Amino acid sequence: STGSATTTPIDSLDDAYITPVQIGTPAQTLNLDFDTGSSDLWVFSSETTASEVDGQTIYTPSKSTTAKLLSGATWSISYGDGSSSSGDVYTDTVSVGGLTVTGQAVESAKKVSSSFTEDSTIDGLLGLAFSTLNTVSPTQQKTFFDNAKASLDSPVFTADLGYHAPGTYNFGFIDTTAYTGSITYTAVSTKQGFWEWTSTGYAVGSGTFKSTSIDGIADTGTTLLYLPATVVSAYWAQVSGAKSSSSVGGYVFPCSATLPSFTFGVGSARIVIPGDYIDFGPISTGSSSCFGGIQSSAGIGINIFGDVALKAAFVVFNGATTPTLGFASK
């Protein structure tokens, strides 16, 4: 089997991407944030504290003839940005782009933190990291991908995120028309539960490539590109007037700037992030200080190849016995 679904930016900045997901019988369609940096499929629901729901579409398990309470199971998750959610668990039928999994753990939110409530466009998350990170207790549950794998034509999914435009998540096949040149594959460590890999270096603008190993995670559920302070300083030093602002929480730059590109290495291959992808607009409405799309990972504890990086590429998440990651230009 295969599946193919369009993923759409939530706003004019590409802060996140949502993908329609069918849950239950009859189908209830929710728009979920596909997140290769976590491993829980959770939704706003009829159980979510009413004051914490503001415009989201909710899953109502009592209206699904295939929903079953997973007795005794609870979940609770905290994300890299400090947001959180928690609740109980149902199993139900879940379909993405025509690919159906029966018995999928659907984690129903009883509580969500403020940045979920305030994001009316995100109805929940669909985790695509390794199932070892799943938070369900006392019996850990499998991701949608893990459940689908055996049925897939090939045990892969691909992320093709757009720049200020829709893109595609495919399951079970590699669309050879969706990228240019060849796909370069690189080793993955699953030891921390993430799609963790090592970039071979970087360049700023038309500058020379610096060969240096940068361990990080491929994370569709994080907006920005978080890299070591040395790398980030080298990037922003090429933008007149750019500076790190403790008050704002990272590098800002004059909105009148033209940003240089940023290249990262995948083996001997190179992925180029155009300068415009690194512009996240005014820090507040009407400000001439703009927020940068490349930020320091210092104090995160890991480097993160978030959407800024991934949307410059066609990315293969290869879930074979020994997982790997592939990147192609597009």
UniProtKB/Swiss-Prot annotation:
Ubl conjugation in keyword set: no
Domain Peptidase A1: 17-328
Active site, UniProt feature: D35, S199
Domain of life: Eukaryota
Catalytic activity annotation: Hydrolysis of proteins with specificity similar to that of pepsin A, prefers hydrophobic residues at P1 and P1', but does not cleave 14-Ala-|-Leu-15 in the B chain of insulin or Z-Glu-Tyr. Clots milk
A biological-process GO annotation: proteolysis
The protein's Enzyme Commission number: 3.4.23.22
Enzyme class: hydrolase
Keywords: Aspartyl protease, Disulfide bond, Hydrolase, Protease, Signal, Zymogen
S-S bonds: C255-C290
GO molecular function: aspartic-type endopeptidase activity
Family the UniProt entry places it in: Belongs to the peptidase A1 family.
UniProt name for this protein: Endothiapepsin
Organism, as annotated: Cryphonectria parasitica
